[PDB]
Amino acid sequence: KNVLIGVQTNLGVNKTGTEFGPDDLIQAYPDTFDEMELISVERQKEDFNDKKLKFKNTVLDTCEKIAKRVNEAVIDGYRPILVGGDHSISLGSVSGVSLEKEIGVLWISAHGDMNTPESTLTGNIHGMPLALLQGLGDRELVNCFYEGAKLDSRNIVIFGAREIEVEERKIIEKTGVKIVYYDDILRKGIDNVLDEVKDYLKIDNLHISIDMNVFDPEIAPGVSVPVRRGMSYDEMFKSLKFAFKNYSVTSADITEFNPLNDINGKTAELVNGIVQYMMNP
Template sequence: MKRAINIFEFPFNLGLTKKEHEIEPGVKKLPDWLKKFNFHTQLNPSNIFRLEGPEYAMDFDEETQVKNPDQIIEYAKKQSDLILKNYNKEIFNIMIGGDCSILIGTAVALKKLGNFGLFYLDGHTDFIPPRLSPSGGVAGMDLALIAGLGHEKLTNINDLKPYLLEENIFCVGNAEVDDQEYVDQVINSDVHYYDLYQLRENGFQKTAEDFLKIVQDKNLDGFFIHFDVDVLNDKIMPAVDSRMEDGIDYHNLKEILVPLIDNEKCFGIEITILDPDYDKDGLYTRAFIENLVQIIKK
């Protein structure tokens, strides 16, 4: 990593439905949690920007069929403004969530900057309409929303629909393959889809290179990486909202991310869903930081 780094902290959790034992999802603590274990210090960012999230709620909206749409839209607009205000194409941006719904604000910003691609690395597709969501949580449908699938209020902020084109998106790493209706949504789209097992078959580095070829061939203005830590194997990262038994390891992660991060068109990466409440001693977080810092600084 030769470029300077900006860190954006987005401690936002309104895209998730809290579990019965929770007061609220703990993912909003992630920026402070990573800072505690010297993630920020090791990366030595030029700037750290922060946008506080609103108070937690579970307000189901009949019109959009999701929870907390108004708060999510308002936050996405502020998030987009903060990103654009501090945009410098020479700088690599690291967004720390929060839940996956923070992708919306970044996608709105990217649409204003040009025609961008997205490498969506996640243990789920998050590519479903509200009718298939048992919880109504936007974090489970954020990829669909940024590609234009869902209610206009969320998909057409500032008349920018779609924020990213399906054909410029790679959805990679889904381990939730048993529900055919769930998987069919992304299969029947123009998104380039590699579930966990197809990813292994195609090769980790090769999948990243296949994506970069599209970026080059289409002469995209840039691309962004979404990294939901639940794509990692449960043995090395159980501190997530929706655990999946299978997943990739840190060696696989390095094979995927290094060619992407090294590419000059990489706008940055967002890190989501690591919940400090499920890693009280920081055991999994320490290993996570050690590996991710090595990958970013390589």
């Protein structure tokens, strides 16, 4: 039993469009998204001198609302499926679930999203969530919902990375996290690499955090930040099938759907199909 929860924010990516993702879908595919529960962003007082931690307090308050409702959904025995909204929302969701169940995570994205104020070149919190869930970054953000890291570095697999800066690379090496590059899917194949996932990540309870930027921008144009050379539809849905079969999927996130840059709902249809397979795997 799944519950759909839309988050209408873009204060992580700080680029116009992805905050319209949830409302856009309610109208594009009502039969799928019509009853989704929408979370109300409450703007919080900020310090705009801080350009390496933009909208810290608001992103944090929103992730707290996310975590609380997601935790209530897990306690009721439902699978929360979060429709964003930029990737920062994951900070909330992963925090609301980890309280009730220690989880692994398949982080499907073109970026590691493991930046810190010291490594970020943008100050965007859409590219810091994983690091913060591993106890790296701002302490108030790390302490969302409950104090302390929310994931074990060993229970994380970053799937489909294509771009990684040196300063973020140093945060990555310090955690020993496993990163499947998209060049791995290109050279070895999606099935061999999915087998590698079965080999490495072994906890049964699994969270799936999807960044729409993992796709090839020709298939998923509607993302505030496109990274060229990404996954196809087939590879993505093979990954989803493998995940739902070889694990117990606790929750999921589909993030960074920017309807403004989309071309005829192609990306919106990608998200529709992802949610529809999640609803009846």
